[PDB]
Every structure is written in structure tokens, then in C-alpha cells.
């Protein structure tokens, strides 16, 4: 973001950089991580149920913002950071709207 | 919802009815013991299909009695009361703790807890009307009810339902 396009780039002793390239886009799955994901999804689901019970205004606001199709750079400021950081290269990102099948919070949780 | 399938029946015939013309006699018996009937496996049995070329063709005399047993195969229409989707039924009778909706053949009831608590039910109505905007219980009373579950028992069909959903109760 804040680099000049026509700077000078030098690299030193990166003769094993292919391994860094490989791990840049490689990932593993474990059982306990799956368990933690299940527990986190349940916690998020119950939190969403509680929020829908007490004040559905924020959820409806988020849902209509997704209906307009805003994104992380659209809504988030600089001082707040994205939770799930962008895993893919920005040249390959999707920039269109969220589908209605996952647009609702409960839809996305079930998804 | 209504279904079509080939189905088998199991019929006794008294030996007094061993006259020369019994095939159509059995067809008649099939009519008034298939049409207008209820079970658990197939629900309310509406009417018969394939009146011609029906499949009986053979029968065994029961050993201890002169009754002759026959096996009848036939296409028909029944009703299958599902669970979990919307029907726009009609209400004929009501109770103090909920209305009894007659969606066609059965009488599905909605408990006073199964109606939404924000529905502005007034007990001083004839019949007691659980209306908020438009779903006033009338002689017509087209109410979008979702069957909870049609609980199956011995051949007397009963169901439960609720209107705690958007456009549920509302058409």
C-alpha cells in the first residue's frame, strides 16, 4: 500500500526462499483445531441468537450493508483491523456482493 | 400432501357371498373399505385409481372358517400429513388456549404457547380470535399454519402446529 512502484529492490541470501513461497500458501488440518472450530461456531451462534434477542438493529444494519455489498475496506477503518486477514493475493480477490445464502448471520453460521 | 402409489390389501369374504358374480362384488367392497379411511402408514386414504384391470385373480379358503381370503393390489390417492412446512388451512372450531385448524381432512391444533406471544390475542371473541393484523378466525379463516409434527398413532390422525414465523398465520 505505502511503497513506491519505481523503488529499488534487492534480495540477499534468499537461495532457499522457495520454501517460504511454499509455506506462504500451504495449510494443515488437525482434529483439535476442528474441535475448536466447532466450539467457536457454537459460541458465535449463541452470541448471534442473544444479539438477535436483545437488539437486532446491528444485525439488520450489517445485513443491509451486505445487501449493498460493502467489503472490509469499505466498512472497516484503519484503526480497526480485519479479524480474518486476507489469505490470498489481492490480484485474485473477489470484489462483488455477498450471496443471500450466507448474507444473513444465521445463514453464514449454518454455512 | 397427497400421494399416489400402488398398494396392497388383505380382504376376507364370507362364504355366503360365493355367488356366481363376485368380482364386481369385491370391487364394491374395495370401494367402501378404501374410500374414506385413515391409517398411520399412509394417512387418510382418499380414493382409488385404476378401476379396471384390477389384481385379485386368486384366493385361498381359510382353514377353520369358510371365509375366503383375497389379496388386492391397487393404485390410489392418499394424504400424507408432513411436518415443518406451510399450509393455508381453515379453522372451524376453537378452544380457550388455541384454535383448531381443519386443513382439509384432519384437525390440527395450535397451543396458546405455540402462538407468538406478540399476537394480541383477545379472549372475548366468538370464536376466540388470535388476531394481530389480519388473521381473524372466521368461517373461512385462511391461516398459514406450519405443521410442527403430525404425530402418528393407531388409525386416528392428529397433528400439531404453530404460527411463530413471518407470514405464518399471515397469507
Amino acid at each position: 500500500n505505502e511503497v513506491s512502484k519505481d523503488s529499488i529492490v534487492i534480495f540477499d541470501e534468499a537461495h532457499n526462499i522457495d520454501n517460504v513461497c511454499i509455506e506462504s500458501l500451504s495449510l494443515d488440518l488437525t482434529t483439535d483445531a476442528l474441535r475448536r472450530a466447532t466450539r467457536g461456531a457454537n459460541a458465535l451462534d449463541e452470541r448471534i441468537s442473544e444479539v438477535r434477542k436483545v437488539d437486532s438493529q446491528k444485525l439488520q444494519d450489517e445485513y443491509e450493508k451486505l445487501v449493498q455489498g460493502l467489503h472490509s475496506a469499505d466498512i472497516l477503518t484503519d484503526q480497526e483491523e480485519p479479524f480474518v486477514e486476507t489469505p490470498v493475493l489481492p490480484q485474485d480477490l473477489l470484489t462483488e456482493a455477498i450471496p443471500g445464502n450466507i448474507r444473513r448471520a444465521e445463514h453464514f453460521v449454518s454455512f | 400432501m397427497f400421494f399416489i402409489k400402488d398398494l396392497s390389501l388383505n380382504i376376507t369374504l364370507h362364504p355366503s357371498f360365493f355367488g356366481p358374480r363376485m368380482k364386481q362384488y369385491l370391487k364394491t367392497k374395495l370401494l367402501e373399505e378404501v374410500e374414506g379411511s385413515c391409517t398411520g402408514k399412509f394417512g387418510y386414504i382418499l380414493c382409488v385409481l385404476d378401476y379396471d384391470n384390477i389384481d385379485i385373480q386368486r384366493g385361498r379358503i381359510l382353514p377353520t372358517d369358510g371365509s375366503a381370503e383375497f389379496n388386492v393390489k391397487y393404485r390410489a390417492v392418499v394424504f400424507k400429513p408432513f411436518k415443518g412446512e406451510v399450509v393455508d388451512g381453515t379453522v372451524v372450531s376453537c378452544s380457550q388456549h388455541g384454535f383448531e385448524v381443519q386443513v382439509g381432512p384432519m384437525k390440527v391444533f395450535v397451543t396458546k404457547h405455540l402462538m407468538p406471544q406478540d399476537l394480541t390475542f383477545n379472549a372475548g371473541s366468538n370464536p376466540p380470535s388470535y388476531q394481530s393484523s389480519e388473521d381473524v378466525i372466521t368461517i373461512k379463516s385462511r391461516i398459514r399454519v406450519k405443521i410442527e409434527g403430525c404425530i402418528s398413532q393407531v388409525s386416528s390422525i392428529h397433528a400439531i402446529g404453530s404460527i411463530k414465523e413471518d407470514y405464518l398465520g399471515a397469507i
Binding site: - | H113, L114, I160
Partner: protein, 96 residues
Amino acid sequence: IKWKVHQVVQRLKDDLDKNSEPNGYMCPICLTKYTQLEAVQLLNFDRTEFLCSLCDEPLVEDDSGKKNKEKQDKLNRLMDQIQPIIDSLKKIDDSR
């Protein structure tokens, strides 16, 4: 300890779920409870009340609807009391 607390949690959660359901009925002559569906199949011809099969007694409704919030609050405060055990369990699962 984990099995007992899990059993207690599931027991009380299903207690609250069951207490959110309609309370039901009973016939006090035979002292036998009756569900809402059992009331439905035991109604009178008037389509108003429900009569017992054996004692032929008009069914009287069970009293648990006010108990729903009481069991919810008992669940909440019991979780509050048990919460240090939950935190210690979390730290134990962190440990080996």
C-alpha cells in the same frame, strides 16, 4: 468431574427446554400426568375441555409455565456459581 458437570449442564439445559414447552395436564383422581397431545386426544364432544379415559375427570392443566423463568434463573446462577470450576477446567485443558 467433567462427566458430572457435563451431565448436570445437559440435564438442566434439557430441563429448561422441556419447561419452555407447554406444561400439560393431569387427572388428580388417578394422580397421573397428561401431555398436551394426550389432552388433545382426550377432549369432549364440545371441543372445549378434556375428560380422563379411566376416571372420566375433566383434565386440569399442569403448572410449570411460571417455573420456566425460575429454572432459567436457577440455571444462570448455578452457572455463575460453577464458573470458577469452568475456568479451572479451561486452564487444565490448557495444561497437560
